[PDB]
């Protein structure tokens, strides 16, 4: 691949070959718009398509601050 494609893909983890469960491939210049935690196919090199996700990961797979969303006034 090119220097640009290599540099861009450093911020991403290549999960595998093209998976059309995630739709038509993004271009390299569109790839930065991919939401954190999501997966997308991307066009690279000479027509190759791979599935990727950002290495920058959001706090999704973590614990909760569920206590407390609601508080009742007693006493």
């Amino acid at each position: 691949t090119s220097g640009v494609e290599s540099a861009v893909l450093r911020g991403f983890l290549i999960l595998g070959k093209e998976d059309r469960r995630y739709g038509p491939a993004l271009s390299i210049n569109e790839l930065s718009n991919l939401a954190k935690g999501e997966k997308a196919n991307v066009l690279i090199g000479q027509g190759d398509v791979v599935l990727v996700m950002k290495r920058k990961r959001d706090s999704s797979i973590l614990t909760d601050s569920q206590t407390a969303t609601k508080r009742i006034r007693m006493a």
Binding site: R55, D58, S65, T69, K70, M74
Partner: protein
């Protein structure tokens, strides 16, 4: 339960009987363990009558008792909160934020906090009724500690949620207020303020920039070292979210000397702290080569490698990302340094875990090391990959071969290609 005279007195025409009755209803809902919320709202006209008393600005105590009664109703299930909203209480409660009575103000905040904290639908509705400007005014003009706590907690409820997140334009003006609140010493205040900041910094880098622009980073980093876990934990969450931004944004956190704090938090006795410290560091090592180097100079990697092989598994997962991200963005000298710390062995050991995602992360870190080994074998004509032997020593080759029995196609295809490319006979 309710009585017939309660109903009849509530709809009388004298404030003496009204205030006494509302206080009876209020006392019922303000009682443990199981409040009669349904019986009160099922009783016709009652909810509407409470809401009508919120408009009685001439009778301070009546307003207070009314707001309290509605507050405890909106503290129940989603359907119980629906009745209060559809009664039209929300636009009135917001007006009461500028009540001349402080006891009415604070209870209005509490009610609105409960309503907004019900769901994303109610949250957006409360925001659409323009709660932010009166609420922030109240917060800055407050003169009581109990009032500020309630205001910040309600504010944090306006920010909470990701399905869908609130419209950022409707919640971002609270950032200057939130920024100043970080300088308080009250633990409860700092806790909810840091949660609100973590909610706002949870998403695309545009939102993160707005958080940064308010100048909260320096203080957020200092709060990493707070002795109360109710404060350090959300503060770490906020810092962790900010370093999910681009290289420039992440650098702001680093220039606040966050790394020595994060190093310290890696040794925390609390399990969730180490994990999120690892998670935070993993998003930094996903940065540029100067930032990876900053993690090296902070002596973080020897600890991450100890964690990678011996810590609680949900902590190992995040350390794996931290090591792997470092191997993808790092220089040959940096990767050579990770190898010298003995990172290959605990990476190989993760190839056999049942979390298929961590397997791929492990595989990626190993492939990164292998590719650099191959490039290194060409820049000196030796044609020998120096890391192939180390991976064999750590039984990585056997484990990679074993992955050809893994049901997951991505893992299979990956292990298959690694063997074909780096371990051909």
């Amino acid at each position: 339960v309710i009585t017939r005279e309660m109903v009849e007195m509530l709809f009388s025409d004298d404030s003496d009987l009204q205030l006494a009755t509302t206080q009876k209803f209020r006392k019922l809902l303000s009682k443990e363990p199981s409040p009669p919320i349904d019986e009160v709202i099922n009783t016709p006209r009652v909810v509407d009558r409470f809401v009508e008393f919120l408009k009685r600005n001439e009778n301070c105590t009546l307003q207070f008792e009314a707001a309290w009664a509605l507050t405890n109703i909106a503290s129940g299930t989603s359907q119980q909160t629906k009745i209060v909203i559809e009664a039209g209480a929300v636009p009135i409660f917001i007006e009461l934020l500028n009540s001349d009575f402080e006891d009415v103000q604070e209870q209005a905040v509490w009610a609105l906090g409960n309503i907004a904290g019900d769901s994303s639908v109610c949250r957006d509705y409360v925001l659409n009724c323009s709660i932010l400007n009166p609420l922030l005014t109240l917060l800055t003009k407050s003169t009581r500690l109990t009032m500020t706590r309630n205001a910040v907690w309600a504010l944090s409820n306006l920010c909470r949620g990701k399905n869908p997140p609130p419209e950022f334009a409707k919640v971002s003006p609270c950032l200057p207020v939130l920024s100043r609140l970080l300088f308080s010493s009250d633990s409860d205040l700092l806790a909810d303020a840091c949660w609100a900041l973590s909610y706002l910094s949870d998403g695309p880098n545009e939102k993160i920039q707005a958080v940064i622009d308010s100048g909260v980073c320096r203080r957020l980093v200092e709060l990493l070292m707070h002795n109360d876990y109710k404060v350090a934990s959300p503060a770490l969450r906020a810092v962790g979210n900010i370093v999910t931004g681009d290289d420039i944004q992440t650098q702001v956190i680093l220039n606040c000397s966050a790394l020595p704090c994060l190093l310290h938090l890696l040794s925390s006795p609390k399990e969730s702290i180490r994990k999120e410290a690892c998670w935070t560091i993993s998003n930094i090592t996903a940065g540029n080569r100067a930032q990876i180097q900053a993690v090296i100079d902070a002596n973080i990697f020897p600890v991450l490698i100890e964690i990678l092989q011996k810590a609680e598994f949900r902590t190992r997962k995040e350390a794996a990302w931290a090591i792997t991200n470092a191997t993808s963005g790092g220089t040959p000298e940096q990767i050579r340094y990770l190898v010298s710390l003995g990172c290959i062995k605990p990476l190989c050991d993760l190839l056999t875990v049942m979390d298929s995602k961590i397997v791929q992360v492990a595989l990626n870190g190993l492939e990164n090391i292998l590719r650099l080994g191959e490039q290194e074998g060409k820049r000196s004509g030796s044609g020998v990959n120096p890391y192939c032997g180390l991976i064999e020593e750590a039984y990585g080759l056997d484990k990679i071969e074993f992955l050809q029995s893994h049901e997951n196609q991505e893992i299979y295809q990956k292990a298959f290609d690694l063997i074909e490319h780096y371990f051909g006979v």
